[PDB]
């Protein structure tokens, strides 16, 4: 009961879901061959939520990993956890993408797509009763922004009624390694908005910061940063596999972050993280907790929740802790920061608490916050992306791959104009 | 038991037979005095030596041939040699005198004074046989004895014998180069028997070869020798899966089956491709895919032709040694997608594979290379058409001011047999001008 | 216990160069629609739908090896068990009877390795040589007609006219007929190669082998030395009614043939509706094709098979309700 | 009771008796040399289903071996199981067929053929009550599509009421390695309507994809697609030799798979064919073996049934396995499927669960489907034989044996109307 399919497109979202898929096997004790090594009983309760039994006691993850060039699937089965999954699920072409959206969405992955959801059904119709899906991708490639887009608006024509919602990577101006990043995130945000019942919009220069700033890392690489969303893309689906004493599903949280439809867009955040050293000065405690959740340099998108107000926050904790602390601190937030709060929403902030802390340590916490301070992300893009397509600059590479500008200044026009949608929600009374 | 008769004639089809003969030896393990060596306590019939060589007792091994000449010279180099004792004494005829570059004299005068003897040989060697295939003729179109006698015994073949298939192996005059003065009247002549008696007659010339041992194998200055050796793996290779095993073998009368059309359609020039200098065979990919490219390739033909300027009819594809029937499908399936390569419209089931285990043998002193693989490609196409209009213009030079007509004329034959042997040729060129096209309503 | 089928023919290309609307569709396995163009007093034109249903239909892209297998194959395990059997080639000039019948026209030469002649002369050898019928050592003869100007001539021979008498059992014969003995297939082919070749045809331009007489093939199965009749398979090819616009250069040598196969075809068309109703003196002797034919209908081991030929076009949609009404009446029948 | 005389006939029939007498001989311990060497009681309570006893507890197949060229022959004595078979069954003449039909079907076989039928009523007549046969051949060679149905075409006319049904091999346009294949394949087709009560037709293209696609086979031979064929032909008679739950014989299966006669084309298939490595990732259970019954990767017969409707299907189970699942996944296909399955039949699957899996695997199955979908099959034949013959292309070599042209009509127009049989019952109500 209440599955998950996981469908990890792209280079960036392939590395994000092979270190999610090491944070999952450790917290229900699968071995990197596929083995049981646990020794709670609650880890086996609900393992049917990411896993299918196969013979003879292994684990097999409903993972279902697409690309458009074999190189990062090499990658990942030779790995630490290319044991792990189900060597039927490893889609892949051989041109590569070219970071283009048009090649991903149009030429090389519709021809691409009939051979992923007959696979994407060989999962969803094993499930005893499906809940929803996740894609783990990126808005800035050709696979993670166009492919992922073509997988996801051919199932809500197929599954219309499951909580679909994506891990997805959006760039910013101080951190760019791509030049036609603008072209590539504005066609698929585009698609998110009509299409998606949450998304968690994530950015790398708010994970550095993180790193830099709050875990006083020296070093960060990739591998880093994929470790801090891998602990949010766990926290969010908690009480879908443990005990707890207040429960939320995907659907749960959905119905209450999720003022009118349209408004999906989320900004996660975990705590705690402190440095390594750092840890026997902290001690642990539910209003420790919460100002690490609500401090802007804890914040998985790169956007200060000054420059807005939460429409509503969600914050699942885990852990032997109390009821009265989380529903006072919970409280004794939102009247403290009253002016960063929409007022036309009396307790804006949901409270989940599961039974079951991570392996190492005791009470961690998840922040999911649907803030009007994300039109600070879309109007950076739309900013880039009409300097550069009122000179039409690199746009032979999409209306050479069957484009058209038509399909351009829709996408344009739809990012401005959820700009207009949270600033009218922010504001007015 | 799959035998067959070698029949060759002339001093071109002598010589061929010279390096078919040579080959075999070498393909079953026969030394040149007839004997298979003493660490043979096997199957010999499981070789499958005698298709080509009838057992005679106490351990000897005798050819199922004929060498034919009306020439003592030729033969006389089998006498001695180096093959002495291999052939049986009374199955290499020599006339006296040659037939002197006249169909004539080959047909007439000279030919009918051993044509008996030659026919009461051949029942000799055709009640030795228990489940004869057919024969196998050599000779050179542009002789005296390679046409003017042929002429005279495929006419006699089919008389007694009739049923059988009659494989011809011919040596068509090539376009600039040309050995013979009256080159062009003898090969108009034999039209009519390569036509109406053989079964499937195929074509080579010097010239197409000669470019293959300067290009393909960069020989600098080829002789005869050099050339016959690649006429003998195109042979080798097609009456290969009548004495080895594989799958997909292919019996003599499954060619025409599936390379004939119409019983006046059965003009197939042959390839062979690879065709690679033993330092050339490094550097190599000699797998089924570019073996099978370089069939379908203009300039590594066996006639000076152009299978673009034509339409192909039918295929036949043999290949040796390490091949997998899997990679056939994947490399038939690329050549049906060039749209160089022109098939017919009433062909759709393109062409025919036959696959061999035994991988072909290096002559020692030979020019090819040690190979895993490799393809023979039978195909007929319309052509070999542009092969007849070049020497029916060099026949109607000639004959527009009856030049050498005075020789043959006073040897045998009349002056009205040119003006139809002329029309006869005539009739097979308007054949593949209303063979290839296709129809509509 | 008379099967009926239809047989709509496509289009020529000429037809298509006059710009000839079809209106004859075969939806179904053995269903017809003609679609008839009307006009109300008003000028305002409307369309007629006129369904029919026969033992079987054929459409216009089936060949004559499909017309054949559900129409003269069945008819061969019959001649077998001593009865007797025939099948017309019924409806207007130009539709196609002689190709079904005689069969393809291929220009200037009749390709009769097709038709109904030969795929049944060579199914009757096929079915004598199983070892259930193998064993009655039976004789297989064929004869071959050809009735014009009202009088039957012949085809084996030359031009032996013949007469039509009767036997004193009330059957008809014909006499003296030339029936020569047949060996295998390859000798009844000879016999109709020979036989259309000396068919009488008029030559024009638009049908230059427009039949002209009304053909029987006869195949007689006689058991050896007896000289009796065990089975009979005769074959009709008819002429054809031809009263449209049949005025393109008509002399008095064309129409004297004329009306005289639209006079032996009434004689056919009353002798059908007089066997519809009951007790009425039969007219069989009016036109000696019905004097032929008397064995199809009140055969008391007789199985015919009829195929209602049918030109496709608007202006032979005429013709077509005309065919199809006498189609349907012969179905419509109870003999004894 | 109930023996089975097996009549393999050419080359290509030939080379799958002998790999399906490898399979058969597995399944009851038959030793290479004949003696017995197995283990279980039921592997020789029902062995006279295939094998007569000889002299000192030998056990001699019940198959007759013909062919028009010696070659075949001496391979199949000279392989591994040249012991097992008796050699006054190797029936063989010595001139070769020409790949002509003609020549095989009139002058070459109809020699031949009194010396084969008095070999087929020794085996006949020695048995306690015969049920059939069954026909291994090749729609496209001389030997097997001629002389198989000179065979065939005179049994009936002695054995007028025992199952004969064949495992014939039919070419397909992407893979041809024939000529002449159209002629031979059409004038075969002919035979095998007005004679044979099943037909499980067979293509090799649909068999090198499944051991590309499915199997991962790398380099396949034809070894490996007759070891598919063989394991479709001893799925078939399987509840006739060992004991099941539901039972289905030959005749059992052609009542209700057969609903008109002269319908009676099928397509085979098998599962479960994983590859090699991907088996301890799936689990064997009965909607796992379903999936691979009617996906349509898994045919051996290279159409697609989404193409047509099943008229009706069978399934085979070979397992100790429950009965509800049988009968509730069997019924989930047909409703979840229903624009696939012909509706005025209600329950178009027949299932069958015998006891017995084969010897190195639990719960295989066998798939049998009596699809309108085959028309695609016939009608790319008669395509290419209307193309070839039009012109006369190819003629004089079956002309000049005793045929003519009214034989190749007749065969093309039977052809076409059998497609218009399965056009009939695909559509119309
Ligand atoms: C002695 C001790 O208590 O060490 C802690 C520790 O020092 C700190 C600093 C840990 C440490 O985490 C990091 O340094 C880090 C590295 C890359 C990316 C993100 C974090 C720790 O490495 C991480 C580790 O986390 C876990 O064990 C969780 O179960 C966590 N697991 C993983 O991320 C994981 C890592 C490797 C392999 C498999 C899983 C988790 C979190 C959410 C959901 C599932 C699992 C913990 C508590 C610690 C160390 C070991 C130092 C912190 O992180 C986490 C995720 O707990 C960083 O800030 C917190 C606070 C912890 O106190
Ligand atoms: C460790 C293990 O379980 O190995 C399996 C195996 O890996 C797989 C992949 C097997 C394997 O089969 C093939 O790879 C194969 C090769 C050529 C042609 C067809 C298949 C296997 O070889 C085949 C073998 O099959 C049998 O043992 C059956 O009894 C089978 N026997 C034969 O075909 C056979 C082969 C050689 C000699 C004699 C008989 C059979 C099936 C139906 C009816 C009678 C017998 C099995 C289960 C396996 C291996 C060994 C790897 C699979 O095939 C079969 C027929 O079971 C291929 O997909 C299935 C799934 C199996 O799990
Ligand atoms: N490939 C090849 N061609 C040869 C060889 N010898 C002769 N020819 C060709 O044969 C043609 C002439 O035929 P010949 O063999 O010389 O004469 P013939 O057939 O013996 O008849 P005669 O003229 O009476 O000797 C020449 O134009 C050569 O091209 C040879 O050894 N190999
Ligand atoms: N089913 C058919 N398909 C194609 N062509 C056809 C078909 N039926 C008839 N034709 C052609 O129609 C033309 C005339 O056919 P024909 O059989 O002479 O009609 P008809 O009624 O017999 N004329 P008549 O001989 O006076 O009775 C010929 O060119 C035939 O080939
Ligand atoms: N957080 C994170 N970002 C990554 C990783 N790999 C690539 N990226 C970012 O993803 C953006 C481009 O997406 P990419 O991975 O190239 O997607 P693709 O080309 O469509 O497969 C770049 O700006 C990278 O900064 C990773 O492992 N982790
Ligand atoms: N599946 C399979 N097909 C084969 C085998 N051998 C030949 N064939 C196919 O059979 C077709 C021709 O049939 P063939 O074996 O030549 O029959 P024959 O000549 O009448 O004996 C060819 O297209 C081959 O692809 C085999 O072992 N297995
Ligand atoms: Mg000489
Ligand atoms: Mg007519």
């Not at chain 2, 006698?149 to 192996?169: A, N």
């Not at chain 2, 050339?280 to 069939?295: D, F, G, M, R, W």
């Not at chain 3, 034919?293 to 608007?314: Q, V, Y």
Request: charged share 25%; aromatic share 8%; proline share 4%.
């Amino acid at each position: 009961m209440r599955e998950i399919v996981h469908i990890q497109a792209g280079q960036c979202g392939n590395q994000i879901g092979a270190k999610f898929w090491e944070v999952i096997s450790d917290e229900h004790g699968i071995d990197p061959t596929g083995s049981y090594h646990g020794d709670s009983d609650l880890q086996l309760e609900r393992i049917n939520v990411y896993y299918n039994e196969a013979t003879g006691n292994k684990y097999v993850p409903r993972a279902i990993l697409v690309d458009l060039e074999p190189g990062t699937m090499d990658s990942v089965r030779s790995g630490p956890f290319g044991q792990i999954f189900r060597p039927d699920n490893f889609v892949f072409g051989q041109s590569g993408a070219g970071n283009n959206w048009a090649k991903g969405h149009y030429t090389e992955g519709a021809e691409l797509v009939d051979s992923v959801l007959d696979v994407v059904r060989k999962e969803s119709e094993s499930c005893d009763c499906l809940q929803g899906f996740q894609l783990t991708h990126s808005l800035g490639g050709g696979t993670g922004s166009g492919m992922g887009t073509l997988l996801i608006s051919k199932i809500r024509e197929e599954y219309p009624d499951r909580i679909m919602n994506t891990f997805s990577v959006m760039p910013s101006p101080k951190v760019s390694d791509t030049v036609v990043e603008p072209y590539n995130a504005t066609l698929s945000v585009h698609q998110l908005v009509e299409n998606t019942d949450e998304t968690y919009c994530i950015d790398n220069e708010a994970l550095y910061d993180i790193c830099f700033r709050t875990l006083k890392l020296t070093t960060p690489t990739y591998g880093d940063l994929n470790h801090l969303v891998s602990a949010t893309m766990s926290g969010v689906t908690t009480c879908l596999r443990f005990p707890g004493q207040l429960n939320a599903d995907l659907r749960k949280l959905a119905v209450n972050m999720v003022p009118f439809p349209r408004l999906h867009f989320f900004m996660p955040g975990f705590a705690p993280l402190t440095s390594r050293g750092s840890q026997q000065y902290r001690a642990l405690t539910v209003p420790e907790l919460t100002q690490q959740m609500f401090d802007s340099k804890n914040m998985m998108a790169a956007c200060d929740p000054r420059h807005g107000r939460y429409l509503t926050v969600a914050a699942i904790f885990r852990g032997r802790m109390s009821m009265k602390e989380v529903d006072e601190q919970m409280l004794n937030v939102q009247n403290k920061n009253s002016s960063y709060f929409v007022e036309w929403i009396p307790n804006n902030v949901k409270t989940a608490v599961c039974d079951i802390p991570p392996r190492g340590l005791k009470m961690s916490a998840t922040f999911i916050g649907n803030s009007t301070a994300i039109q600070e992300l879309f109007k950076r893009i739309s900013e880039q992306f009409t300097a550069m397509f009122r000179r039409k600059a690199f746009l032979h590479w999409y209306t050479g791959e069957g484009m058209d500008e038509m399909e351009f200044t829709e996408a344009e026009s739809n990012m401005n104009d959820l700009v207009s949608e949270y600033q009218q929600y922010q504001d007015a009374t | 038991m799959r035998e067959c008769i070698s029949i060759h004639v002339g001093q071109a089809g002598v010589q061929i037979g010279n390096a078919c003969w040579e080959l075999y030896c070498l393909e079953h393990g026969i030394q040149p005095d007839g004997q298979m060596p003493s660490d043979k306590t096997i199957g010999g019939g499981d070789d499958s030596f005698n298709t080509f060589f009838s057992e005679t007792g106490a351990g000897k091994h005798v050819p199922r041939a004929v060498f034919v000449d009306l020439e003592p010279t030729v033969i006389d180099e089998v006498r001695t040699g180096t093959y002495r004792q291999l052939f049986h004494p009374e199955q290499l005829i020599t006339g006296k005198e040659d037939a002197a570059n006249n169909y004539a004299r080959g047909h007439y005068t000279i030919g009918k004074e051993i044509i008996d003897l030659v026919l009461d040989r051949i029942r000799k060697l055709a009640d030795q046989c228990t489940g004869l295939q057919g024969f196998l003729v050599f000779h050179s179109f542009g002789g005296g004895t390679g046409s003017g006698f042929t002429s005279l015994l495929m006419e006699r073949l089919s008389v007694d014998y009739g049923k059988k298939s009659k494989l011809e192996f011919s040596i068509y005059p090539a376009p600039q180069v040309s050995t013979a003065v009256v080159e062009p009247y003898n090969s108009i002549l034999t039209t009519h028997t390569t036509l109406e008696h053989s079964d499937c007659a195929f074509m080579v010339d010097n010239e197409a070869i000669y470019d293959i041992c300067r290009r393909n194998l960069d020989i600098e200055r080829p002789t005869y020798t050099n050339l016959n050796r690649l006429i003998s793996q195109i042979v080798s290779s097609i009456t290969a899966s009548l004495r080895f095993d594989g799958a997909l073998n292919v019996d003599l009368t499954e060619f025409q089956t599936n390379l004939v059309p119409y019983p006046r359609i059965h003009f197939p020039l042959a390839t062979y491709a690879p065709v690679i200098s033993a330092e050339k065979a490094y550097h190599e990919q000699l797998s089924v895919a570019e073996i099978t490219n370089a069939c379908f390739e203009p300039a590594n033909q066996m006639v000076k032709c152009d299978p673009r300027h034509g339409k192909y009819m039918a295929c036949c594809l043999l290949y040796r040694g390490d091949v997998v029937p899997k990679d056939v499908n994947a490399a038939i399936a690329t050549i049906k997608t060039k749209r160089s390569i022109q098939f017919v419209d009433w062909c759709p089931t393109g062409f025919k594979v036959g696959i061999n285990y035994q991988p072909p043998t290096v002559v020692p002193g030979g020019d090819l290379a040690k190979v895993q693989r490799a393809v023979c490609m039978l195909s007929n196409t319309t052509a070999i058409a542009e092969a007849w209009a070049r020497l029916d213009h060099k026949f109607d030079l000639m004959y527009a001011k009856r030049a050498f007509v005075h020789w043959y004329v006073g040897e045998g034959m009349e002056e009205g047999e040119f003006s139809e042997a002329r029309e006869d040729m005539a009739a097979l060129e308007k054949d593949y001008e209303e063979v290839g096209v296709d129809s509509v309503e | 216990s008379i099967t009926v089928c239809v047989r709509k023919r496509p289009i020529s290309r000429k037809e298509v160069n006059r710009k000839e609307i079809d209106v004859i569709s075969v939806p179904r396995k053995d269903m017809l629609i003609v679609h008839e163009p009307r006009s109300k007093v008003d000028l305002t034109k409307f369309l007629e739908n006129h369904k029919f249903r026969f033992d079987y239909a054929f459409n216009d892209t089936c060949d004559n090896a499909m017309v054949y297998k559900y129409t003269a194959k069945p008819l061969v395990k019959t001649i077998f068990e001593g009865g007797m059997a025939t099948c017309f080639a019924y409806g207007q000039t130009g539709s196609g009877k002689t190709h079904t019948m005689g069969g393809e026209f291929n220009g200037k030469v009749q390709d009769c390795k097709n038709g109904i002649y030969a795929m049944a002369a060579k199914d009757v050898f096929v079915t004598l040589n199983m070892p259930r019928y193998r064993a009655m050592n039976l004789v297989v003869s064929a004869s071959f007609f050809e009735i014009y100007s009202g009088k039957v001539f012949d085809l084996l021979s030359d031009k032996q006219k013949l007469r039509v008498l009767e036997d004193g059992k009330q059957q008809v014969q014909v006499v003296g007929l030339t029936e020569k003995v047949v060996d295998g297939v390859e000798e009844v082919l000879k016999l109709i190669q020979h036989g259309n070749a000396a068919r009488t045809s008029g030559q024009t331009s638009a049908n230059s082998n427009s039949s002209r007489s009304h053909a029987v093939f006869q195949i007689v199965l006689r058991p050896q030395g007896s000289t009796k009749i065990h089975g009979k398979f005769s074959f009709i090819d008819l002429a054809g009614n031809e009263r449209g616009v049949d005025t393109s250069s008509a002399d008095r040598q064309t129409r004297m043939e004329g009306a005289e196969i639209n006079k032996s075809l009434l004689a056919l068309k009353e002798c059908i509706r007089a066997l519809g109703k009951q007790s009425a003196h039969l007219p069989f002797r009016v036109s000696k094709l019905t004097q032929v034919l008397r064995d199809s209908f009140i055969g008391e081991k007789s199985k015919t098979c009829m195929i209602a030929m049918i030109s496709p076009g608007l202006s032979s949609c005429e013709h077509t309700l005309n065919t199809l009404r006498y189609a349907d009446r012969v179905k419509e029948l109870v003999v004894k």
